[PDB]
Amino acid sequence: QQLTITNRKGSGGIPSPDDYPALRKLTLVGPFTDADLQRLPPSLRELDLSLCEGPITAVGIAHLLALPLDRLDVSGCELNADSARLLAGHPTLTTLNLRRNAIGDAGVAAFARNKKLTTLNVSSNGIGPVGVRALAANTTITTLDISNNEIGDEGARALASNTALTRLDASDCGIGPEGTQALATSTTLTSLDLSYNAIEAEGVEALGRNTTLRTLHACGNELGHREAELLAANTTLTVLNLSSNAIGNAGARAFGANTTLVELNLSNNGIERVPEWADNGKLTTLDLSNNQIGDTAAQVLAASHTLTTLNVGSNRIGDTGACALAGNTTLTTLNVSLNRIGKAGMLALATNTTLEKLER
């Protein structure tokens, strides 16, 4: 019902459908040729050609069209816009990945016509803003990744005009404040990832004033505590992630008041003090890894009535904090990796029965 073939000596003959007619997944690894997948069993409903390194050309894709699978490679194999058009051709494919394939603008333009693809990943294919203007025409992909393609603010606006996309990853797309507000004004987007982007304070303010997003990523855009306050004010988001910023103690303190967020990842923000999240808040999943949390902040954290999933790896909590945390009977997933905790704290944690998963 599932296979993984990993030939590295030239190209291994594919097993005919006679060998096994009961197959859902095929994973292929190493160098291969196009006829190899020509012999593919129609039993197959999925196909991973990420790990293959062979010189697959448009002819491969062509033979694949026959297969009734609804899943495609996770990396492509230096496909060109030719295999992009060809792939939009595929009838049953509901999820296709094409990351790091460098099909031009033209290539992605093709999927503008697809009517079955619900989820497309065309990540770091060199797509300028014009393939975006093209592809935003689609009316069917509900989920789409344009990361590491330089789509400026115009590709941002283009996408903000689309009205089928509910999930858009746009990390490191060269977006700025303007395209950020463009996207902030959408009303199909429930979840959006503008990381490594250099959106500015104005873009953050746009997003703070949004009321249609439910999930938002802003990792590595240098957001300070101002941005943190702006965001924290937003009462509509349930899942926020601001890793690798400088939201400092002040931004943490801001989020302390937010009784609306459910999960909040504040890793790598140089936080030292943590505030007191409101009781009867909604936050249940806090991530504070790679901060500069001492034992004191661990005791504060340990006092939360609502947290059930705390991550506090790569910090400085010693035994006192490990104990205090262990006293928490409401937590159920606690990670305390890479800390300063010693055999006393290890024991103290061992006593805790309420906990379900623990990394130490």
What amino acid occupies position 181?
Answer: Q
The answer to whether 89-212 and 222-360 have equal CATH topology is yes
Among residues 203, 200, 167, 164, the alpha carbon closest in space to that of 185 is found at: 203
Q: Is residue 106 helix, strand or coil?
A: helix
Are 140 and 111 within 8 A, CB to CB? no
Are 196 and 219 within 8 A, CB to CB? yes
**Could you write out the DSSP letters of every residue in 316-351?**
---HHHHHHHHT-SS-SEEE--SSS--HHHHHHHHT
Q: Fold for domain 89-212?
A: 3.80.10
- Class for the domain spanning 222-360: alpha beta
Degrees to nearest 5, angle at CA 320 with 316 and 326? 100
Are 131 and 104 within 8 A, CB to CB? yes
Are 219 and 195 within 8 A, CB to CB? yes
Alpha helices in the chain (DSSP H): 34-38, 58-64, 81-88, 105-111, 129-135, 154-161, 177-184, 201-209, 225-233, 248-257, 295-302, 319-326, 343-350
Cα gap 244→82, rounded to integer Å:
39
Are 170 and 150 within 8 A, CB to CB? no
Query: What experiment produced this structure?
Result: X-ray
H or E segment and range at residue 306: none
Cα gap 346→35, rounded to integer Å:
57
Adjacent-strand bridge partners of 26? 3
Cα gap 220→317, rounded to integer Å:
25
Among residues 82, 76, 73, the alpha carbon closest in space to that of 104 is found at: 82
H or E segment and range at residue 295: helix 295-302
| Resolution expressed in Å | 3.3
Are 19 and 44 within 8 A, CB to CB? no
The residue assigned the tokens 């496909």 is: 79
Q: Is the Cα torsion angle 82, 85, 87, 89 positive or negative in sign?
A: negative
**Domain boundaries along the sequence of the chain:** 1-77, 89-212, 222-360
